[PDB]
């Protein structure tokens with residue numbers, strides 16, 4: 001399985017989303033809420 | 049036509065909601081994009097999803113990332129150069145990683161036949177169980193000799209489903225399977241007389257030093273891609289100087305071909321936004337001992353006599369390069385700044401605090417410091433504000449937003465998801481460049497009353513004001529401009545906020 005649940009230490013890392021664990025990269029990334037962009041979903045993707 | 053350009057994406061390997069939403073955002077960003085200024089990321093894409101728009105992409109200035117794709121084919125057919133201005137994982141300009149699926153097959157087709165030079169960086173291939181014939185591609189011609197050691201390319205595909213390369217193909221190195229999908233050698237096949245690239249092995253068939261990937265002749269215009277700078281159809285090492293050296297000159301050798309420097313190109317005249325230096329270049333900020341003045345309404349570097357104003361860098365640049373928003377750690381450095389030589393971000397994480405960045409919470413009263421600023425060279429982004437305050441009090445004295453740098457390359461002013469009742473940007477007189485977006489502010493009213501066109505300076509600027517408190521709701525609550533100012537709108541309910 002590509003996606004794993006992040007450990008609770010990565011709780012607030014995703015500002016507008018949920019943390020996901022990539023096992024192949026062995027790293028923590030984000031699942032952004034709709035409309036938010038960035039690694040941590042920090043900035044709102046501004047509609048034209 | 050000219051050159052169609054897209055800013056690119058730097059989201060690394062982060063999902064944007066559902067898979068379909070992610071693919072949607074991708075196609076918006078890279079539709080019709082001939083040249084990518086930023087990073088081209090193809091991630092979380094699904095099988096049987098159309099990706100043909102990628103055929104239009106000719107250039108990528110940053111890095112190319114291709115990962116988490118269950119797709120059979122990504123058509124970067126016309127991509128020819130990766131400048132390597134930005135590296136992924138600090139050492140890879142091209143990365144193809146973990147392109148697998150629940151089924152064994154993942155990515156199988158990557159026909160970058162036109163790809164010939166990666167100016168900076170290395171290439172990494174990993175966890176690719178369906179890739180075809182990319183193994184045969186020899187990367188001595190494509191990748192720079194200095195970055196060859198950092199390359200870590202390993203292919204893991206024993207399916208044998210991939211076919212073989214055509215007999216007309218040099219050393220059997222082919223991208224896909226057809227004769228069009230083969231290695232084009234413009235570096236290894238060159239003679240010892242050529243400097244850089246070459247059209248053929250003969251000494252008569254060399255490329256000019258600034259010809260980048262390849263050439264059709266030993267001329268600057270015959271360069272397919274420009275290496276450093278570009279003038280008309282020619283490629284040059286430097287923008288032509290307004291004053292050049294001469295063996296004997298009665299007067300300074302003013303060059304009729306001399307042009308100003310803007311980004312990768314050389315323009316005839318710098319924009320009104322940028323500092324026109326005496327050397328001849330479009331610069332964003334004056335250096336040391338130099339401050340900004342207007343000789344004829346255009347900004348220039350005049351030498352400070354002794355003490356000189358502090359150059360307060362914006363958030364996201366300089367010392368605060370990796371800082372997401374202004375916070376308690378960096379707010380002290382903006383104590384007595386009258387100008388923001390950069391761009392200013394405000395995000396909700398600052399008030400809550402972040403343990404990952406070891407950042408303490410931000411005090412709402414401290415924000416009052418920002419009252420000293422009157423000019424923002426870049427852009428203003430406000431996604432958070434103290435709940436007690438009903439207006440943007442700190443930016444009440446802000447006058448001009450130069451918009452030299454814009455959020456997502458488009459918006460110079462952004463105010464999203466705030467509870468403020470009024471903007472209160474009374475002193476704002478000019479938005480020199482960039483669009484304005486005011487969205488999702490549930491209790492904000494006094495936005496459409498203002499004519500933003502008078503604020504806009506550069507042609508083509510547009511405004512987008514939506515999802516704020518309705519005009520009927522604000523009118524029913526008596527939240528309409530004061531009677532002392534009939535036209536031009538206002539920034540708030542009180543008479544002080546009226547425009548002139």
Ligand SMILES: *[C@@H]1O[C@H](CO)[C@@H](O[C@@H]2O[C@H](CO)[C@@H](O[C@@H]3O[C@H](CO)[C@@H](O)[C@H](O[C@H]4O[C@H](CO)[C@@H](O)[C@H](O)[C@@H]4O)[C@@H]3O)[C@H](O)[C@H]2NC(C)=O)[C@H](O)[C@H]1NC(C)=O
Nearest residue numbers: 138367368370371372373375377378397398402404405407
């Ligand atoms: C609040 O404001 C403060 C002050 O501006 C801000 O602190 C900054 O945080 C970032 C991120 O933690 C720091 O940047 C790091 O610097 C160290 C220095 O050794 C680097 O090792 C780090 O490297 C990471 O990033 C690299 C790519 O840039 C990766 O290649 C690498 O593998 C690491 O992942 C990282 O660059 C920065 O130094 C501080 N600055 C100060 C003055 O403390 C903080 O981020 C702000 N908080 C919020 C929530 O915005």
Ligand SMILES: *[C@@H]1O[C@H](CO)[C@@H](O)[C@H](O)[C@H]1NC(C)=O
Nearest residue numbers: 072075076078079080081101
């Ligand atoms: C991409 O651009 C073309 C050219 O204008 C347009 O016809 C097409 O609808 C665009 N695609 C999307 C998804 O907007």
